[PDB]
Amino acid sequence: IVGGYTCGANTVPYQVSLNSGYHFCGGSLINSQWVVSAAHCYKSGIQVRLGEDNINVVEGNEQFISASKSIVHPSYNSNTLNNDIMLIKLKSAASLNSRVASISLPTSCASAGTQCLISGWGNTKSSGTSYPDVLKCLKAPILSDSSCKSAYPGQITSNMFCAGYLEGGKDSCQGDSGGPVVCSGKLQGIVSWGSGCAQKNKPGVYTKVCNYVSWIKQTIASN
Ligand SMILES: CC(C)(C)NC(=O)NC1CCN(C(=O)[C@H](Cc2cccc(C(=N)N)c2)NS(=O)(=O)c2cccc(-c3ccc(CO)c(F)c3)c2)CC1
Ligand SMILES: [Ca+2]
Numbered sequence: 001i002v003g004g005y006t007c008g009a010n011t012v013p014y015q016v017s018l019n020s021g022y023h024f025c026g027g028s029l030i031n032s033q034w035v036v037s038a039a040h041c042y043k044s045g046i047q048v049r050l051g052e053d054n055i056n057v058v059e060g061n062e063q064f065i066s067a068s069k070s071i072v073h074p075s076y077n078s079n080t081l082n083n084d085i086m087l088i089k090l091k092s093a094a095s096l097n098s099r100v101a102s103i104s105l106p107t108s109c110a111s112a113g114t115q116c117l118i119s120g121w122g123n124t125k126s127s128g129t130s131y132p133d134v135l136k137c138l139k140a141p142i143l144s145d146s147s148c149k150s151a152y153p154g155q156i157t158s159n160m161f162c163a164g165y166l167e168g169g170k171d172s173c174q175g176d177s178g179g180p181v182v183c184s185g186k187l188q189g190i191v192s193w194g195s196g197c198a199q200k201n202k203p204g205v206y207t208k209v210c211n212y213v214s215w216i217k218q219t220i221a222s223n
Contacts, residue, residue, distance in 0.1 A: 001118065002126050002198040003170035004138035009053035010061060012119045012135060014103035014187075015180060017049040018088075019064075026120045026179025028187055029102045032093040034220050037178035038190050038207065039076040039086040046070065048090060050100045055121055056133045061099045065090045071219055073212070082157045084192040084207045087219055105217075106186040109210035112144040116163060116183035118204070120191060122175030126168070126198035131175065138172070140164045142183065143203055151201055159211050163189065164203035172204045173197035181206050 016027040016035055025041035027048065035048055051061040068091040073083040094100055110116075118138045124130050140163050148162035156162075163181060164171050172179075172191045181189025189206030196202055 001120055001122055001136035001138050001176060002124055002173050004136045007119060007135045007137040009059070010051065010099040012117070012137065013099050013101035015052070015119050015135060017052050017055055017121060018178065019047045019049050020045050023055050023121055023175065025175070025177050026191065027088065028180040029094065029100070030105060030187070030216070031102050031220070032096055033090050035088040035090070036187070036190065036216065037086055037088060038084045038192055039072045040078065040081060040084055040192070041178040042070060042072050042086055046088060048088065050094055053135055054133045063094055063100060065092055065094060067091065069223065071223065073215070080155070080157070081193050083159055085190060085209070085212055087216065089223060103180060103182060103187045104185060105213050106188055106210040107213070109208065110142055110183045110186070110188045112142050114142050114183050115139055116142060116181045116188065118163070118172050118176070118179070118181050118191065120172060120176030120179040122177070123173040123197065126171070126196070138170055140170060148203065148205070151203060152195070152205065156205070159208050160192065160205050161189065161208050162203040162205055166201055166203060168198050168200040171198040
């Protein structure tokens with residue numbers, strides 16, 4: 001997260017870190033057994049880390065749980081990042097508490113101008129590299145689809161939306177992928193991609209979760 005603020009420990013209790021020896025992507029807890037992340041974060045050997053603030057220090061509220069199965073969206077395209085969503089099942093159910101909590105799925109999509117909370121452990125620099133140990137947060141509005149497509153001609157599908165600031169300076173970044181965009185109490189987005197980070201006229205692009213609620217519900221009921 002570039003241009004954000006330190007969230008405060010466990011203030012985003014649905015945020016998870018995906019770990020394969022090191023943090024490599026975010027995710028969001030959607031019930032005690034299931035996490036939703038970005039398909040481009042897929043790999044084998046995932047450990048889900050819940051209850052985290054400082055990802056380099058054991059602070060006493062963590063749960064570490066191996067994935068038992070991953071399900072990438074059937075229509076995910078790795079060239080274009082269309083349908084950049086996957087589901088991860090936990091080998092054992094998380095113990096839900098004030099620091100380890102699920103986030104509700106949308107029942108409707110959100111509108112341009114609505115303010116959202118975006119979070120993660122990704123790079124904090126728009127030029128260069130600095131990785132934080134504690135969770136970072138950013139408040140940012142959904143942008144109109146026309147401004148999104150104007151920024152990224154030929155690249156935006158109906159399964160994507162832009163959020164952020166066209167002037168630059170405030171954005172998600174490398175290592176935030178897979179993590180949450182929460183608007184009015186609902187998981188509306190997954191951190192997916194952008195051209196650089198926090199650059200002028202290059203806002204963040206997010207998977208449009210509201211298009212996937214039926215697939216999520218049916219997939220988790222059958223697995
Ligand atoms: C290795 C594997 C095959 C799994 N792919 C993978 O890991 N991809 C991730 C995809 C997501 N990535 C990025 O977009 C990165 C960092 C980043 C991450 C999240 C949000 C933001 C932001 N600014 N909010 C920025 N930005 S980047 O360095 O410019 C870069 C490097 C390579 C590729 C594309 C890119 C751009 C556009 C499209 C779609 O048209 C695209 F498909 C890719 C951008 C990391 C890299
Ligand atoms: Ca920790």
